[PDB]
Coordinates of C-alpha atoms and ligand atoms in Angstrom, one line a residue:
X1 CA 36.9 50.6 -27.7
X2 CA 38.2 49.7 -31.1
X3 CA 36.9 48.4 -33.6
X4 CA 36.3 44.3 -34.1
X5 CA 36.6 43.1 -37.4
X6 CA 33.4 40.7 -38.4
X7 CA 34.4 37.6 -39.3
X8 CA 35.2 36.6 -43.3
X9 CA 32.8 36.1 -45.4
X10 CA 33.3 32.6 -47.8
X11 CA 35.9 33.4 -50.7
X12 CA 35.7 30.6 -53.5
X13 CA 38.6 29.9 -55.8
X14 CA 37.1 27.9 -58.7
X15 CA 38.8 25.4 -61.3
X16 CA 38.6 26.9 -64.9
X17 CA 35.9 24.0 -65.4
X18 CA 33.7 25.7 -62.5
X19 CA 34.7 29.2 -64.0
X20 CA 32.2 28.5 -67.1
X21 CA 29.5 30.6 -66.1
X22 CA 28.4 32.7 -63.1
X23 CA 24.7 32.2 -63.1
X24 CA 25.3 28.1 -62.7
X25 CA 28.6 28.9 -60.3
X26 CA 26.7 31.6 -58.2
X27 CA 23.6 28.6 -58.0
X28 CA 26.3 26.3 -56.3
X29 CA 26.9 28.3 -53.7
X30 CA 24.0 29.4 -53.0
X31 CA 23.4 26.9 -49.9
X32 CA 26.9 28.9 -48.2
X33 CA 27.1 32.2 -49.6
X34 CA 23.5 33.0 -49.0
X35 CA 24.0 32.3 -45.6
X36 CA 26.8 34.9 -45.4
X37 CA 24.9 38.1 -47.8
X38 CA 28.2 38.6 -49.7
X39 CA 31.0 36.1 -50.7
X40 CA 34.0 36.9 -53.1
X41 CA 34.9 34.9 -55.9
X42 CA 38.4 34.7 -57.4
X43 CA 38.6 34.2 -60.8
X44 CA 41.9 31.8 -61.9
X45 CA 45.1 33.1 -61.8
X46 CA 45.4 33.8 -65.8
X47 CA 42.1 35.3 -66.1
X48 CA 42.6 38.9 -66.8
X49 CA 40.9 41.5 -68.7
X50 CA 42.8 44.9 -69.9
X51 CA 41.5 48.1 -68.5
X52 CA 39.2 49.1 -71.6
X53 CA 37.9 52.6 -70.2
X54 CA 39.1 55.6 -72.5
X55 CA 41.3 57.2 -69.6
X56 CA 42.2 59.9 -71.8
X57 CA 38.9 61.9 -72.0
X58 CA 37.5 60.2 -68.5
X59 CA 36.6 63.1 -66.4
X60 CA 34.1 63.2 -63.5
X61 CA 33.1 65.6 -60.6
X62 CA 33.3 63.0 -57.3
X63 CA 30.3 63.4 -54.5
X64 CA 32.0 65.0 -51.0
X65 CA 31.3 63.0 -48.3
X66 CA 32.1 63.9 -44.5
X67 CA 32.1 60.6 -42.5
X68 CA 30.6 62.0 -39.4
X69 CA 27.3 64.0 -41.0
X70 CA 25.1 61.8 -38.4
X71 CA 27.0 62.0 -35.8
X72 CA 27.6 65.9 -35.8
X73 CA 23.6 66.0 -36.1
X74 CA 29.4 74.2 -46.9
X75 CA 31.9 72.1 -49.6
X76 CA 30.4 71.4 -52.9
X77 CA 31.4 68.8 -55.7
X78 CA 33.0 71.4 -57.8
X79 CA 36.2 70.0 -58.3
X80 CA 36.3 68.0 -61.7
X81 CA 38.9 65.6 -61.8
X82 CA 40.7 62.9 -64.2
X83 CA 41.4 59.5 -63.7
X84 CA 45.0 60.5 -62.9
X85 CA 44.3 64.1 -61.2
X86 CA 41.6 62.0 -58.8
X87 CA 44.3 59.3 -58.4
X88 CA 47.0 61.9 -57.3
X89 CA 45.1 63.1 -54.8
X90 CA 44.0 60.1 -53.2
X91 CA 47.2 58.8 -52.7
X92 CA 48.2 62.3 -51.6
X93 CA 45.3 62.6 -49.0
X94 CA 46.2 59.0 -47.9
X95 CA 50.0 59.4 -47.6
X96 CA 49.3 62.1 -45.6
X97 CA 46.6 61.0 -43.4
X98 CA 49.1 58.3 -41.9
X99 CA 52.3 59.3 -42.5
X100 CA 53.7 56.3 -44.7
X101 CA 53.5 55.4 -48.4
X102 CA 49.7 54.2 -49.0
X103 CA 50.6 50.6 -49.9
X104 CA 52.3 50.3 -46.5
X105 CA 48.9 50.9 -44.1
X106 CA 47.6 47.9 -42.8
X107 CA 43.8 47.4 -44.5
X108 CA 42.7 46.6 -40.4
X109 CA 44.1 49.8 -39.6
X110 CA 42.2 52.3 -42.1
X111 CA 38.9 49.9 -41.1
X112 CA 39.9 50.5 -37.5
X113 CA 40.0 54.5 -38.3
X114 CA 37.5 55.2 -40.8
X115 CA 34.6 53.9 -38.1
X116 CA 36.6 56.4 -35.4
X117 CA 35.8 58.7 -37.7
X118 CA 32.3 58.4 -38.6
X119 CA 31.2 58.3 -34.9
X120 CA 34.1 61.1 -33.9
X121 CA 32.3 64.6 -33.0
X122 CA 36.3 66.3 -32.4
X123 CA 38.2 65.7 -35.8
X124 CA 35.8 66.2 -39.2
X125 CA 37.1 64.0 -42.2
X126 CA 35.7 64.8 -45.7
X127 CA 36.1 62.8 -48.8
X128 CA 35.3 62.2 -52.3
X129 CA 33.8 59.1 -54.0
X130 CA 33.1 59.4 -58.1
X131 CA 30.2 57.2 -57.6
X132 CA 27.0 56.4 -59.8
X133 CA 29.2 56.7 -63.2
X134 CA 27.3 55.2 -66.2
X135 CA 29.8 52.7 -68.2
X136 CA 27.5 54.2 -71.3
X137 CA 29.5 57.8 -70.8
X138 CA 32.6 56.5 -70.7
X139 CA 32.9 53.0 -71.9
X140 CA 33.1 49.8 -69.6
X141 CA 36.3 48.8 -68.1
X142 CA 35.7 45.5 -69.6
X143 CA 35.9 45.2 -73.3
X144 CA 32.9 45.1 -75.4
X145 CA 32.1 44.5 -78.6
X146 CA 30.4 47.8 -79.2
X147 CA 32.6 49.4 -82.1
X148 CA 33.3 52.9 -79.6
X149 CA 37.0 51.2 -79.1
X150 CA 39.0 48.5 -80.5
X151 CA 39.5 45.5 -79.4
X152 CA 42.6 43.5 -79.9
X153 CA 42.1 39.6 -80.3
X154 CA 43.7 38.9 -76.8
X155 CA 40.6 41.0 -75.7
X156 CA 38.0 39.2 -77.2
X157 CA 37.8 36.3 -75.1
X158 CA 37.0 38.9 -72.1
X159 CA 34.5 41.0 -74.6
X160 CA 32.7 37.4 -74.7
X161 CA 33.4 36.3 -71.2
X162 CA 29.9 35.5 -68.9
X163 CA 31.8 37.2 -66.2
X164 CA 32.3 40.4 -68.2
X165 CA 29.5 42.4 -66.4
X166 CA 28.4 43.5 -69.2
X167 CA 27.1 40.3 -70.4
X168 CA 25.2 39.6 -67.1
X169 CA 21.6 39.0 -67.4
X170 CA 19.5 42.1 -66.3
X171 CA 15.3 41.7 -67.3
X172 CA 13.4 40.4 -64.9
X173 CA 10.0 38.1 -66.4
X174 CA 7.2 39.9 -66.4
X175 CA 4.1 39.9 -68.0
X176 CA 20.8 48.3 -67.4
X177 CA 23.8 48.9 -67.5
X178 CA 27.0 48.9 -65.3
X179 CA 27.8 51.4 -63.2
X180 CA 31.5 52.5 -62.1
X181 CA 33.1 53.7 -59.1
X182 CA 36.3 55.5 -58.6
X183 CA 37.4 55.7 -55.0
X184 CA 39.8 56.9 -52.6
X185 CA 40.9 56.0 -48.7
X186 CA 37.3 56.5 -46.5
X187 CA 35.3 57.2 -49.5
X188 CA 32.2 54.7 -48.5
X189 CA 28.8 53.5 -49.1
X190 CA 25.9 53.4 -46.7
X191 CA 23.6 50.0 -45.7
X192 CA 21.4 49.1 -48.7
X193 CA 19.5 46.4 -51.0
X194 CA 19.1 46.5 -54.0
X195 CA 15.8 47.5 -56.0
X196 CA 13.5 45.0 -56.5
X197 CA 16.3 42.8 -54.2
X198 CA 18.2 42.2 -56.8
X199 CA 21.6 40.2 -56.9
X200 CA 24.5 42.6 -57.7
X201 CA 28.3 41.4 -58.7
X202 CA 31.3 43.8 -58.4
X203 CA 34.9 44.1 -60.2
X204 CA 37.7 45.4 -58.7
X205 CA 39.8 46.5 -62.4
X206 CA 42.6 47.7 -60.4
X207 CA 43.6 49.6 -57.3
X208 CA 43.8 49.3 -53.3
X209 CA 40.9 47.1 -51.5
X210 CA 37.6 47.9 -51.2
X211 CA 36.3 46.5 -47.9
X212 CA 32.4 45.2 -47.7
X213 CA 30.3 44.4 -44.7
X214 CA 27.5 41.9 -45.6
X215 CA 24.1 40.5 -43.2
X216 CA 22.6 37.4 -44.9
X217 CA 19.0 37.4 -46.4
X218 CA 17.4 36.0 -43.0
X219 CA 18.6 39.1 -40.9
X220 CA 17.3 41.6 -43.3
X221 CA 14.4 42.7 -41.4
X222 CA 16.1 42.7 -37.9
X223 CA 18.6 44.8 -39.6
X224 CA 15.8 46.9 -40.6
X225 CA 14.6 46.9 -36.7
X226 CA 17.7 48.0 -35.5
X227 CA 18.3 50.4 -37.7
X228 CA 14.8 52.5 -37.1
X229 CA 15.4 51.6 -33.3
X230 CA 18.8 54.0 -33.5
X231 CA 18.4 56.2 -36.6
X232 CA 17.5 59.7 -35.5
X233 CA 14.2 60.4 -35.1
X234 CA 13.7 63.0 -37.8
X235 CA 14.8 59.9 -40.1
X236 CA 13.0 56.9 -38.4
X237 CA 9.9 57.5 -40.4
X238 CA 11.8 57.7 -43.9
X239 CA 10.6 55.4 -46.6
X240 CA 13.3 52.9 -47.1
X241 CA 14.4 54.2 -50.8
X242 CA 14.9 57.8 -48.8
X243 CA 16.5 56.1 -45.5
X244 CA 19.3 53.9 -47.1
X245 CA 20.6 57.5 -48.1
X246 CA 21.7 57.9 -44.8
X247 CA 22.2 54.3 -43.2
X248 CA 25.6 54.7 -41.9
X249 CA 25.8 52.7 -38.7
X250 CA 28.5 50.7 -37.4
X251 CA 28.9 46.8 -37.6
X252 CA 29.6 46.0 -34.0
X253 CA 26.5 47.7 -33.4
X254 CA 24.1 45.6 -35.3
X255 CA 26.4 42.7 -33.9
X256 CA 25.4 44.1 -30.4
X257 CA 21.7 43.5 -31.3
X258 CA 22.4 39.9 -32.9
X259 CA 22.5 40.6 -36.3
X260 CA 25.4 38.5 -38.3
X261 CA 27.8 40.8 -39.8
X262 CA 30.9 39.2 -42.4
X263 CA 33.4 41.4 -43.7
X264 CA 35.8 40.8 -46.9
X265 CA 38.6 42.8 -48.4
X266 CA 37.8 42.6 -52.5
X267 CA 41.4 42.8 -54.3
X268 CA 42.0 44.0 -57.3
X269 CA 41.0 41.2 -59.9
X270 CA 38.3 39.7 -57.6
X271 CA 34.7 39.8 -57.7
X272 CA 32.2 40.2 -54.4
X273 CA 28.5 38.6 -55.0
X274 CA 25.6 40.1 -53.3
X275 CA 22.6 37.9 -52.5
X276 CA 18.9 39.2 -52.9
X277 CA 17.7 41.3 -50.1
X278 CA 21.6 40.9 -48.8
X279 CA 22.2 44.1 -47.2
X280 CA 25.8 45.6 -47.2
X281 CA 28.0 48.5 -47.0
X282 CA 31.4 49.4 -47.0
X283 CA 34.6 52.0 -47.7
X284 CA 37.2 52.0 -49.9
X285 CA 41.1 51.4 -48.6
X286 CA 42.8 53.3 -51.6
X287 CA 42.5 54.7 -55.0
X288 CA 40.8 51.9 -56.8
X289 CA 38.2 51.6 -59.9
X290 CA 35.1 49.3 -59.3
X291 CA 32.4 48.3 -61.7
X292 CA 29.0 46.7 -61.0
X293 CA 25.8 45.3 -61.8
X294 CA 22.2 43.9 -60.7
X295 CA 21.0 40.5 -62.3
X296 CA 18.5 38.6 -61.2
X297 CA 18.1 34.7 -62.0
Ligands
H6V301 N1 25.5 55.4 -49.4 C1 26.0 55.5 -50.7 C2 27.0 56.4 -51.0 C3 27.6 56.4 -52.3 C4 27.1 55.6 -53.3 C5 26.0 54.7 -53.0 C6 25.5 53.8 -54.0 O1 25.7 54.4 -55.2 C7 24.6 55.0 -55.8 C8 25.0 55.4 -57.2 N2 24.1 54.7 -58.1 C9 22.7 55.2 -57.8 C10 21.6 54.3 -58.5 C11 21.8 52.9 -58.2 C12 23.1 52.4 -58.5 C13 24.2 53.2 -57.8 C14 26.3 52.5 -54.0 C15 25.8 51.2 -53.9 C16 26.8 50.2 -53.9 N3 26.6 48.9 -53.8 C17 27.7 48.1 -53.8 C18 29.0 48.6 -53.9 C19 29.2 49.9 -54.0 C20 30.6 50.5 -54.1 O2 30.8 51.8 -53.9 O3 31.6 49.8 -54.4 C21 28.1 50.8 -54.0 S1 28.0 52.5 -54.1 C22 25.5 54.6 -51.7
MN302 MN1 24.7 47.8 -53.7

């Protein structure tokens, strides 16, 4: 039985007068979009920043994944890459996994395969995902006033934009930086919230869709049932920190047991929203180059 694609989660187009700022936008729709977990946001049409990492010296040595490690329950990340070395090989891999040029597969198809594959026991798919890389190592891909690079004066507007991630709000009252993520067709992410159930916001800078799952706020804990009612025994009794490690489980299943599930494909130029305590998850279609934050309001 294939695959059934959840259904969309809310994508908002807002006027350059509701562009201001994203704390007062993402408190607008917060009566629809935390009803959904995630929501995309489109930024308009003439909003958009240059590429500001230093792609000369970026270099980074990707995490291996194989997509059916739960399932069927010895490669290494050795293999250091560049932006462009990484890049040729994720098109390669991808152009060669099905047989057409990688802009020409159909997003629902590659959804439709990558969850084959993580439940197939016959055909073992491995991957690599340059995940958890600190924008401190090798700059932002937004501009930022930080004297490492120039900035031009068409840049400075975004160096000063509230929806540069780096300008996000990140301390909590009481009495961070962005990460980056380089990825390639099937390269994924598990379920998981955020520490302390934080909000998070995510950039596309360029590149083939990443595809999210999201299950609003009021699900999280029959989520969280489901998941220790079908995770292997051996992990059932995990703390949650340790368990999200390995929380690969497929939509349609947690649909099955009544939790809502909504799905988006985040373009390149588009931002996806996470709620507090909004679980999600998802897999990248293509090469692509993500960066992203927590904030909390
Ligand atoms: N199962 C899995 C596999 C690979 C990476 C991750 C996790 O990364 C961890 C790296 N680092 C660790 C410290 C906290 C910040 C992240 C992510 C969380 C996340 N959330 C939203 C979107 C994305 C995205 O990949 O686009 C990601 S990836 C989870
Ligand atoms: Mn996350």
């Amino acid at each position: 039985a294939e695959f059934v694609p959840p259904p969309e989660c809310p994508v908002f187009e807002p006027s350059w007068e509701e562009f201001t700022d994203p704390l007062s936008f993402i408190g607008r729709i917060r009566p629809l979009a935390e009803k959904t977990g995630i929501c995309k946001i489109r930024p308009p049409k003439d909003w958009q920043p240059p590429f500001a990492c230093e792609v000369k010296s970026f270099r980074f040595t990707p995490r291996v994944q194989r997509l059916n490690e739960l399932e069927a329950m010895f490669e290494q990340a050795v293999r250091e890459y560049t932006l462009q070395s990484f890049g040729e090989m994720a098109d390669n891999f991808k152009s060669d996994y099905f047989n057409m040029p990688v802009h020409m597969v159909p997003t629902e198809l590659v959804e439709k395969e990558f969850w084959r594959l993580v439940s197939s026991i016959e055909e073992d798919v491995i991957v690599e995902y340059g995940a958890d890389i600190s924008s401190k190592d090798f700059g932002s891909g937004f501009p930022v006033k930080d004297g490492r690079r120039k900035i031009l004066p068409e840049e400075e507007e975004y160096a000063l934009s509230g929806w540069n991630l780096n300008n996000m709000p990140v301390l909590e009252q009481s009495v961070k930086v962005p990460w980056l993520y380089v990825g390639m067709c099937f390269s994924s992410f598990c379920w998981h919230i955020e520490d302390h159930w934080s909000y998070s916001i995510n950039y596309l800078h360029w590149g083939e869709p990443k595809t999210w799952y999201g299950v609003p706020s009021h699900a999280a804990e029959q989520l969280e049932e489901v998941m220790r009612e079908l995770a292997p025994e051996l992990f059932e009794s995990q703390p949650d920190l340790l368990h999200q490690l390995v929380t690969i489980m497929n939509p349609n299943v947690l649909m099955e047991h009544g939790v809502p599930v909504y799905r988006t494909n985040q373009c390149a130029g588009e931002f996806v929203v996470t709620f507090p305590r909004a679980y999600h998850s998802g897999f990248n279609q293509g090469y692509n180059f993500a960066e992203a934050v927590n904030f909390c309001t």
